[PDB]
Scaffold this active site. Structure first.
Site, PDB file in Angstrom:
ATOM      1  N   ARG A  57      -8.814  18.105   0.467  1.00  0.00           N
ATOM      2  CA  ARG A  57      -9.130  18.520  -0.911  1.00  0.00           C
ATOM      3  C   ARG A  57      -8.367  19.766  -1.297  1.00  0.00           C
ATOM      4  O   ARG A  57      -7.822  19.838  -2.393  1.00  0.00           O
ATOM      5  CB  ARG A  57     -10.628  18.700  -1.061  1.00  0.00           C
ATOM      6  CG  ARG A  57     -11.385  17.384  -0.987  1.00  0.00           C
ATOM      7  CD  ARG A  57     -12.892  17.587  -1.029  1.00  0.00           C
ATOM      8  NE  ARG A  57     -13.316  18.379   0.135  1.00  0.00           N
ATOM      9  CZ  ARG A  57     -14.576  18.703   0.404  1.00  0.00           C
ATOM     10  NH1 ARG A  57     -15.566  18.304  -0.394  1.00  0.00           N
ATOM     11  NH2 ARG A  57     -14.844  19.413   1.489  1.00  0.00           N
ATOM     12  N   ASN A  64     -14.669  14.041  -2.112  1.00  0.00           N
ATOM     13  CA  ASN A  64     -14.890  13.221  -0.926  1.00  0.00           C
ATOM     14  C   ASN A  64     -15.990  12.251  -1.304  1.00  0.00           C
ATOM     15  O   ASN A  64     -16.936  12.637  -1.956  1.00  0.00           O
ATOM     16  CB  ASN A  64     -15.509  14.074   0.185  1.00  0.00           C
ATOM     17  CG  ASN A  64     -14.487  14.823   1.000  1.00  0.00           C
ATOM     18  OD1 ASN A  64     -14.824  15.542   1.953  1.00  0.00           O
ATOM     19  ND2 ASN A  64     -13.244  14.628   0.689  1.00  0.00           N
TER      20      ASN A  64
END
Ligand SMILES: [Cl-]
Length: 98
Positions: free
Chosen positions: A23, A41
């Site tokens: 990320r 996620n």
């Protein structure tokens, strides 16, 4: 569409893509390319989000999502959907959604 036409596309990445700084690296690459959108996620061990920006930048991002990712990730597959042309950006930044 490529060049400066603005596009929006949804993505989902599969492989070893969680717990590997995916990320953070995705957000940094998106900002570096001048893109807006988000990354998150999922509960299925995958990473998903959307990208919006000039066609040429979005495509480089698509390649980055299919081939590179974070240093320790291993991308097995990248799926893109709902690609569309847009006149204005919906998002103002590239977020990491938690
Ligand atoms: Cl990660």
């Amino acid at each position: 569409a490529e060049g400066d036409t603005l596009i929006s596309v949804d993505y989902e990445i599969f492989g070893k893509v969680q717990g590997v700084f995916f990320r953070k690296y995705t957000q940094a690459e998106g900002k570096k390319l001048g893109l807006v959108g988000w990354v998150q996620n999922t509960d299925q061990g995958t990473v998903q989000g959307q990208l919006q920006g000039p066609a040429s930048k979005v495509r480089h991002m698509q390649e980055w999502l299919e081939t590179k990712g974070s240093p320790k990730s291993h991308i097995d597959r990248a799926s893109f959907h709902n690609e569309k042309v847009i006149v204005k950006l919906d998002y103002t930044d590239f977020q990491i959604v938690k």
